[PDB]
Ligand binder design. Structure first.
Ligand SMILES: CSc1cccc2c1N(C(=O)N1CCC[C@H](C(N)=O)C1)CCCO2
Ligand SMILES: [Zn+2]
Length: 139
């Protein structure tokens, strides 16, 4: 679990969005596993606007933050799970690192701010849904 709080927006994994999130929807994209809902109070997370490929992510299944190198946002095949059929997920970045189902929502950050959140994993890999292209989160 986990979310990004920027301005009057809450960014979560679409597959983990609560009933309150759908009742206050701003934008969602199943192909990116992202959902943005509106908030009453202002959030303090700063979104990164960069092309960094190194950062630190939070891994709830280890209660630890790990430094990682990660790929550029890409269209990547994700096998069928309990949340989606087999499909290509867009804007996804992979890194070599531990992740389990329960770790989705963990933040990935670089020196410029929030880069994305854990969205996929398996086989000693961890994948993050990029948010650096969503310029509108800043306004
Ligand atoms: C951090 S998720 C994870 C981590 C390790 C092993 C894993 C996972 N699972 C996932 O990758 N998914 C479940 C949640 C939604 C994902 C998506 N964006 O399509 C897919 C479950 C199946 C494969 O097994
Ligand atoms: Zn950066």
């Amino acid at each position: 679990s986990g979310a990004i709080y920027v301005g009057n927006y809450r960014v979560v994994n679409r597959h983990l969005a609560t009933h309150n999130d759908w009742a206050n929807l701003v934008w969602e994209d199943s192909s990116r596993d992202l959902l943005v809902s509106s908030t009453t109070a202002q959030g303090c997370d700063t979104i990164a606007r960069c092309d960094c490929q190194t950062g630190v992510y939070y891994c709830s299944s280890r209660r630890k933050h790990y430094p990682v190198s990660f790929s550029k946002p890409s269209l990547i095949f994700v096998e069928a799970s309990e949340y989606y059929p087999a499909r290509y997920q867009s804007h996804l970045m992979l890194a070599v690192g531990h992740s389990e189902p329960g770790d989705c929502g963990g933040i990935l950050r670089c020196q410029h701010g929030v880069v994305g959140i854990v969205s996929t994993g398996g086989n000693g890999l961890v994948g993050f849904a990029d948010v650096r292209d969503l310029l509108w989160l800043d306004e």
